[PDB]
Write a protein that binds this ligand. Structure first.
Ligand SMILES: [Fe+3]
Ligand SMILES: [Fe+3]
Length: 198
């Protein structure tokens, strides 16, 4: 697990090692920091996985793809966002290289790279979580934070959605390690009793 923090908004990209080996979750920005991270790691990612298509999570995809021809997995419901992520970036006074097409569709119940894909909308229409039971953990993007939860006013978000989606998450192993797209890690158990959103 190569937690690594990219981009002006400090998002949390992850290199994970599975049975089928290395994958990269949410290459947010700073390819070089990412490309150079591989220089040393030795582990090159067999595929880029996206929890959602928000610009702060997909800003490095273009570069990485044009350098290692990795396929890009994303839930189809986020395509529209994904395709418009670069303009979204400019709403923050920032800028990303428009994410490349095509992409391979993610899907509820789908198994890949040891992970078990859960569709958990709310923060966005195509937001998913990557559950690693062999890892005892979960890469849940902007869904769950240490003491907070994903925004629900960004275009495409929905509180009621985010809420049913969270309740789902919070019914897995309390001891499950949360790997969020921003800030310190945590656990479903910890958040259950501490988070002001629960
Ligand atoms: Fe987000
Ligand atoms: Fe984010």
């Amino acid at each position: 697990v190569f937690p690594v923090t990219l981009g002006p908004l400090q998002e949390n990209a992850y290199l994970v090692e599975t049975g089928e080996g290395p994958v990269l979750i949410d290459p947010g920005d700073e390819p070089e920091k990412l490309l150079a991270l591989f220089q040393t790691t030795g582990l090159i990612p067999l595929a880029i996985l996206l929890t959602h298509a928000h610009f702060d999570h997909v800003g490095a995809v273009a570069p990485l793809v044009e350098a290692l021809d990795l396929p890009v997995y994303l839930h189809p419901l986020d395509l529209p966002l994904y395709e418009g992520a670069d303009l979204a970036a400019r709403a923050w006074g920032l800028a990303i290289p428009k994410p490349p097409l095509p992409v391979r569709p993610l899907e509820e119940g789908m198994r890949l790279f040891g992970f078990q894909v859960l569709h958990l909308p709310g923060h966005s229409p195509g937001h998913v979580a990557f559950y690693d039971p062999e890892g005892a953990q979960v890469f849940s993007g902007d869904l769950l934070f240490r003491g907070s939860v994903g925004r629900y006013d960004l275009p495409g978000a929905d509180p009621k959605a985010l809420f049913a989606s969270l309740k789902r998450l919070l019914s897995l192993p309390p001891e499950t390690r949360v790997h969020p797209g921003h800030g310190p890690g945590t656990t479903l158990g910890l958040e259950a009793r501490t988070n002001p959103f629960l």
